[PDB]
């Protein structure tokens, strides 16, 4: 019967909780209370980027940290030259309902996906002058989320069918399938090393999956609601999670438990698009009160507020070199933030 | 000032050319009407789609009526969280809701009672606080042969009216309209469909014209 199996699972969960609590001698706040604070931050936008006519859900600049891919609900993928405020390519999407963009480390492929249950890969550096759909991938029974780019031949995505997939670019067939989530899966940030990845489901669970082995290794439950944002802390030993409630949580990888959380009583709205700087000192998250928030990712205290937007911020990212921060909201406006 | 680096001169212009295309699509999207189709169970969704199409994601419809390109999106093929992707359909011209009259007898709580909460969630949704809603009462002919045999008291214990279509249908329409908690800013266009005198497309066109008048008034000052 299943009663003894359920009891054994409960006992295993209790043992896991006891082991997690055993290695809780001190918290991160106590350690970081003796370090210099980040101080006041007054980053301002120096860009216009006025070419969209719908809500934007697009980030993942690329390796060059100069070209930025952008998508909206009008079914157009635009490549922005951030340095000169220019448009490179305009790809008309077959499905106008899309929330996913990737630029690939090579920089010659652009991936998109949404409620069409279709992952579209478009080739950029082609002999012709247009942008052709390099491949169409199907097999998901839910809205697509994230099109991360393990290699030029492998792409990992998530869907609302509580599964994650890893497909091959050359062959349009399923290669690796992950089925361990009980809710919709998004937030698939692809590590600093690309050897691993994590998925944030809608049942307050963040699960790390082995790319080669194809099995789950660690499960993190510290939220009280759905998680819709993730990062990987380019050091590679922790990751940040954002939920629809106004709180963010930093889960350590080796410790396999939460270190600390960023929250405030003055904010009640949601959180999207969690990203990290190249050093991990700052955490930037697009909140749902028409502005972004920058937190100190070591102690607790806030660092700054980026209010240069009119609608809810949906996408937000930082370049590989950490030069500037891109932010896209629902007002069809993309902003680039820099220090002074 | 800096000669614009020659090649970049040909670059920005290309970007401008893209702009020339982009707005050309955007304006094309301005004069296009987008409608959202929803339903709890079968609700005669396939029948309505087939009827209006002659004139695993989203089954879009490209049908046109009197120089007005209507867009119909079906979201019943997705089995996932509703509110995760319900904000993408905000700002549509109108939303079409289909329910079945003959669903008060079948169960799996009856189907119509299950549709009531869906209708309440859609009408009271924050993203749809200013969009007119069109409701279709399908399976009208089945009600005629079902009400005589199956009394309406099973679904409505607080009903004591005459067991006639002209009264039961009116009561059902009123009950569906009572769920509109924001009637001061939204309106419900309720209509019955049948396999004859196909005025359903004409009714949808009239509702679209009404909501277009509403939107134009919002844009042009008054109301």
């Amino acid at each position, epitope marked *: 019967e299943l009663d003894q199996l359920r009891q054994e699972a409960e006992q295993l969960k209790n043992q896991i909780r006891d082991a997690r609590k055993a290695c809780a001698d001190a918290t991160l706040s106590q350690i970081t209370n003796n370090i210099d604070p980040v101080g006041r931050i007054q980053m301002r936008t120096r860009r216009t980027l006025r070419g969209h006519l719908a809500k934007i859900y697009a980030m993942h600049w690329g390796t060059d940290s*100069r070209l930025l891919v952008s998508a909206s609900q009008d079914g157009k993928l635009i490549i922005w030259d951030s340095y000169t405020t220019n448009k*490179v390519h305009a790809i008309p999407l077959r499905s106008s309902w899309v929330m996913t963009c990737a630029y690939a480390p090579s920089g010659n492929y652009v991936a998109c996906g949404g409620l069409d249950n279709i992952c579209s890969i478009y080739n950029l550096k082609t002999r012709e*002058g247009n942008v052709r759909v390099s491949r169409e991938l199907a097999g998901h029974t839910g809205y697509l989320s994230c099109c991360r780019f393990l290699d030029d031949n492998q792409i990992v995505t998530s869907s609302g069918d509580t599964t994650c997939a890893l497909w091959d670019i050359e062959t349009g067939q399923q290669t690796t399938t992950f089925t361990g989530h009980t809710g919709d899966v998004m937030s698939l940030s692809l590590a600093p090393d690309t050897r691993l990845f994590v998925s944030g489901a809608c049942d307050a669970s963040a699960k790390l999956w082995d790319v080669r082995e194809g099995m789950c290794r660690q499960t993190f439950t510290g939220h009280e609601s759905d998680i819709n944002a993730i990062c990987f802390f380019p050091n590679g030993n922790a990751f940040a999670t954002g939920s629809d409630d106004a709180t963010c949580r930093l889960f350590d990888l080796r410790a396999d438990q939460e270190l600390m959380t960023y929250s405030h009583d003055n904010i009640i709205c949601g959180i999207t698009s969690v990203s990290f700087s190249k050093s991990g000192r700052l955490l930037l998250a697009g909140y749902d009160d028409f502005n972004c928030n920058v937190w100190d990712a070591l102690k607790a205290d806030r660092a700054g507020v980026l209010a240069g937007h009119d609608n809810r911020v949906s996408c937000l990212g930082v370049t590989d070199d950490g030069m500037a921060v891109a932010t896209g909201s629902w007002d069809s406006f993309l902003k680039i933030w820099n220090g002074s | 000032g800096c000669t614009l680096s*020659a090649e*970049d001169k040909a*670059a920005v212009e290309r970007s401008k050319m893209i702009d020339r295309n982009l707005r050309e699509d955007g304006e094309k999207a301005a004069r296009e009407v987008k409608l959202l189709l929803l339903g709890a169970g079968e609700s005669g969704k396939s029948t309505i789609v087939k009827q209006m199409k002659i004139i695993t994601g989203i089954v879009e419809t490209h049908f046109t009526f009197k120089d007005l390109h209507f867009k119909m999106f079906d979201v019943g093929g997705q089995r996932s969280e509703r509110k995760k992707w319900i904000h993408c359909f905000e700002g549509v011209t109108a939303i079409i809701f289909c329910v079945a009259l003959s669903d008060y007898d079948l169960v799996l709580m009856n189907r119509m009672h299950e549709s009531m909460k869906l209708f309440d969630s859609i009408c009271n949704n924050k993203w749809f606080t200013d969009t007119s809603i069109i409701l279709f009462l399908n399976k009208k002919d089945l009600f005629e042969e079902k009400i005589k045999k199956s009394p309406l008291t099973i679904c409505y214990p607080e009903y004591a009216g005459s067991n006639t279509y002209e009264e039961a249908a009116a009561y059902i329409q009123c009950q569906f309209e009572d769920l509109n908690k924001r009637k001061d800013t939204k309106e419900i266009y309720t209509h019955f469909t049948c396999a004859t005198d196909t005025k359903n497309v004409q009714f949808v066109f009239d509702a679209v014209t009404d909501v277009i008048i509403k939107n134009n008034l919002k844009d042009c000052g008054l109301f």
Partner: single-chain antibody
Amino acid sequence: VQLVESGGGLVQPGGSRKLSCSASGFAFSSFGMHWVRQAPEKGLEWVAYISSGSGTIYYADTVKGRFTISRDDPKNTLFLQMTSLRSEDTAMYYCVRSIYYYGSSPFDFWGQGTTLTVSSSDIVMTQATSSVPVTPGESVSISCRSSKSLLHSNGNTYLYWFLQRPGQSPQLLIYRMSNLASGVPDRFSGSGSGTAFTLTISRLEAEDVGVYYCMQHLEYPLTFGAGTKLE
């Protein structure tokens, strides 16, 4: 991708004639087009250029105000008409394609050429060596010089290298003196500094001899180089 041109022949001086360049295999409507004239024994020369969408059109100094150009995207063709021909216009005309975006490769593919015969402050580029023997397996260097500093105030140079095989149209080798062209062998390389550029060929094999041309792109009146020939 294919570019084929027609309209050649022998014409008396003072006449008018049009050349038609038709492209099959790529998007004509989004590509700028250039015309390059080659003398029977001298080097390549620029004629005119028309941008995508017929936005900006430029002509050479010797042909300004006399030649005319046009395109038809639905027909995917480029027409260039000349009036009042002279003896100095006797050259083979190449219709070439280019695109201008971040990390683009202008002048990537050239045309085939048409034989036209007549019965009767610009930045200059000079190559010190015009001919030098080569051997199958040794490394060689080709030097190009410019009268102006091609290093624009953005971080990149506008040098191009073109190879003309003995019987084939010129083909791009490297662009911007630092990026390799598509489909070209990795043996070729380029480097240098302001007003002094070099191109290095290492592990050279057979079936690669021809004429080498260096291009500046700082300002529209593009001027070819003298030409380096290896045999």
